[PDB]
Amino acid sequence: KELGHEVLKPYDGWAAYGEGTTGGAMASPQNVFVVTNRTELIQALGGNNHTNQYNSVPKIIYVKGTIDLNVDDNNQPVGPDFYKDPHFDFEAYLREYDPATWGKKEVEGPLEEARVRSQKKQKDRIMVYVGSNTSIIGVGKDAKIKGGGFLIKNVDNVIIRNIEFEAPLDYFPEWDPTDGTLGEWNSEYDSISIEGSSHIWIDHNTFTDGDHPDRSLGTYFGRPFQQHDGALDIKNSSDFITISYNVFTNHDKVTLIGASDSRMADSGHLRVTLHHNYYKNVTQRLPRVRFGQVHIYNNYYEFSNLADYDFQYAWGVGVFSQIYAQNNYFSFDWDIDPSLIIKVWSKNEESMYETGTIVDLPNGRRYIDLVASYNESNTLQLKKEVTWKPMFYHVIHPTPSVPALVKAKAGAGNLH
């Protein structure tokens, strides 16, 4: 059958739970589309971006070529001027809220309100809603999505495959003087944002900041102008998700699973499986987890100290997380302290299981206990123990075979 007819294997990750994930595989021939631009994409998804989220009709959408979501209704590229509120001016915003004169007071006033409206206009245009029972599949080796992202909100049964996503740029990042000690700029757009949705399969896609690395975005208020956000974020009670054979490269914050320490509504959810993904020269959240039983296996993480993106940490152990990591392979071209690979964000002794981890450093290649490594050099301890046993997987490859396999098969254009 067609590529759009392919569905998630019976035991391939949490997304296989119950009836599994079939996306728009059962779509009628009249509901199989080929799109080449923003308008055609929104039309194939329903005809109206906002209400498209309620379109649960089985549908297959093939993405051919490059689709820039940062375009007007005539599909012509637009710049910040197109979105800019009449009461907003970047320079004026810089002068008004610089930490050196505004301090750490809550950002407010006409300029901020104007920034919010400008941001909303871009958001309403570049974040494409995806309805239930949808399969968005890239054609060939050059299917690309840029300037925007997919919003998988309050829907179920969605498949996204074979597409190269260039992370969307937020033209009106919010300045938060209290984010950290020095404050930080924060953006809203992700290439794929999964919110309150279940049974989602993200497979063989490539995520990159591409032609717009953070390094080229500049600095304001003495802080990097972070116009990017997540590559693939999962939050607000989303559940049963499988992230496989994807490439995540040249990006800062990759994958968030659970966005709040206090959202108890996430408890019992956020069950995600991530396997055979290629993380190359990314900074953090690979992934960062809160509440979920997240299965992480056969992933290849590769970092070079020459990369534009520094490395902070890979596995974020958040509140009530239940990470179960198996046979992941890490490669660094510098003698990094392996205790830095795991980072914990909690007030309690969290539990996680980890086994078969290999670290490949200039001083040697070997199996390593990352949890033990973390504990030896940190304060708050992490307990290595089995609290649950992953059942949704067909095969777990031996760790030394991971690099060759992932490098060869992960990412857009590497199927068939």
Q: How far apart are CA 119 and CA 59, in angstroms?
A: 30
CB of 175 to Ca ion, least distance (A): 17
Task: Find the binding residues for Ca ion in span 259-288 (CB under 5 A).
Answer: none
CB-based contact 249:208 (threshold 8 Å)? yes
Q: How far apart are CA 248 and CA 277, in angstroms?
A: 7
Closer residue to Ca ion, CB minimum distance, 122 or 357: 122
CB of 186 to Ca ion, least distance (A): 9
CB of 71 to Ca ion, least distance (A): 22
CB-based contact 129:196 (threshold 8 Å)? no
Q: How far apart are CA 108 and CA 254, in angstroms?
A: 29
Asked whether residue 335 is marked as a ligand-binding residue, the answer is no
Beta bridge partners, 66, equal 144
Q: How far apart are CA 328 and CA 337, in angstroms?
A: 17
Among 230, 287, 356, 411, contact with Ca ion (rule: CB under 5 A): 230
CB of 188 to Ca ion, least distance (A): 7
Closer residue to Ca ion, CB minimum distance, 230 or 390: 230
CB of 358 to Ca ion, least distance (A): 31
How many other CB atoms are there within 10 angstroms of residue 281's CB atom? 21
**Total residues contacting Ca ion (rule CB under 5 A)?**
4
Quick check: 170 binds Ca ion (CB under 5 A)?
no
Stretch of residues binding Ca ion (CB under 5 A), selected from 72-80, 186-194, 195-203, 323-331:
186-194
Closer residue to Ca ion, CB minimum distance, 146 or 235: 235
Stretch of residues binding Ca ion (CB under 5 A), selected from 17-25, 31-39, 190-198, 282-290:
190-198
Quick check: 233 binds Ca ion (CB under 5 A)?
yes
Stretch of residues binding Ca ion (CB under 5 A), selected from 66-74, 109-117, 227-235, 387-395:
227-235
CB of 274 to Ca ion, least distance (A): 17
Closer residue to Ca ion, CB minimum distance, 230 or 356: 230
Stretch of residues binding Ca ion (CB under 5 A), selected from 81-89, 90-98, 183-191, 327-335:
183-191
Asked whether residue 233 is marked as a ligand-binding residue, the answer is yes
Quick check: 190 binds Ca ion (CB under 5 A)?
yes
Beta bridge partners, 186, equal 174
Tokens at residue 264, please? 């108890």
Stretch of residues binding Ca ion (CB under 5 A), selected from 151-159, 185-193, 219-227, 375-383:
185-193
Tell me, yes or no, if 38 is annotated catalytic. no
Asked whether residue 190 is marked as a ligand-binding residue, the answer is yes
Closer residue to Ca ion, CB minimum distance, 285 or 397: 285
Active-site residue, from 285, 288, 290, 365: 285
Among 12, 229, 302, 350, contact with Ca ion (rule: CB under 5 A): 229
Closer residue to Ca ion, CB minimum distance, 248 or 353: 248
Q: How far apart are CA 194 and CA 235, in angstroms?
A: 6
Annotated binding site: 190, 229, 233
> Residues interacting with Ca ion, by CB under 5 A?
190, 229-230, 233
Q: So which residues are the catalytic ones? A: 285
Annotated binding site for Ca(2+): 190, 229, 233
